[PDB]
Write a protein that binds this ligand. Structure first.
Ligand SMILES: [Cl-]
Ligand SMILES: [Cl-]
Ligand SMILES: [Cl-]
Length: 148
């Protein structure tokens, strides 16, 4: 659970996934966490979210995973173990955020996307979250979708 134990490589393509081994590495500083899902007019994805987050002084799930020396299984909608691993990592990341949260959300989302079905409900249940603002991945339009 220690955020400073963040240097030794944890490679989940070579070991069994257990989210409790990375709970500390998934911690974030307040008012920095980003989420993302979907595309607008084809524009979006994990890399657009990473660029937007880093330009605004924040982090994403994937940037946190990379920066803390974790390798996740390749996500594939038809490989159950990788679906479960990403769902659990997303849930623990979301459990631990605080303050003002941002999300790069496209107008077209995949069925079963983790944002609508896992992460956003977790954030609404998180008393430490004070605001959720979406950012369109193509246009940059921002909307406050939740403010407690
Ligand atoms: Cl994903
Ligand atoms: Cl859905
Ligand atoms: Cl997803």
């Amino acid at each position: 659970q220690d955020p400073s134990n963040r240097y030794s490589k944890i490679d989940f393509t070579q070991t069994d996934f257990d989210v409790e081994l990375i709970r500390g590495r998934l911690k974030t500083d307040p008012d920095t966490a980003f989420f993302w899902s979907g595309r607008t007019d084809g524009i979006g994805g994990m890399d657009v979210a990473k660029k937007i987050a880093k330009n605004k002084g924040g982090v994403t799930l994937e940037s946190t995973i990379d920066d803390t020396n974790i390798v996740m299984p390749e996500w594939d909608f038809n490989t159950p173990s990788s679906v479960t691993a990403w769902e659990e990592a997303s849930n623990v990341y979301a459990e631990q955020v605080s303050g003002e949260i941002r999300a790069v959300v496209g107008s077209e989302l995949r069925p079963g996307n983790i944002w609508e079905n896992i992460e956003l409900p977790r954030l609404k249940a998180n008393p430490n979250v004070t605001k959720v603002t979406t950012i369109d991945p193509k246009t940059g339009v921002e909307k406050i979708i939740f403010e407690r």
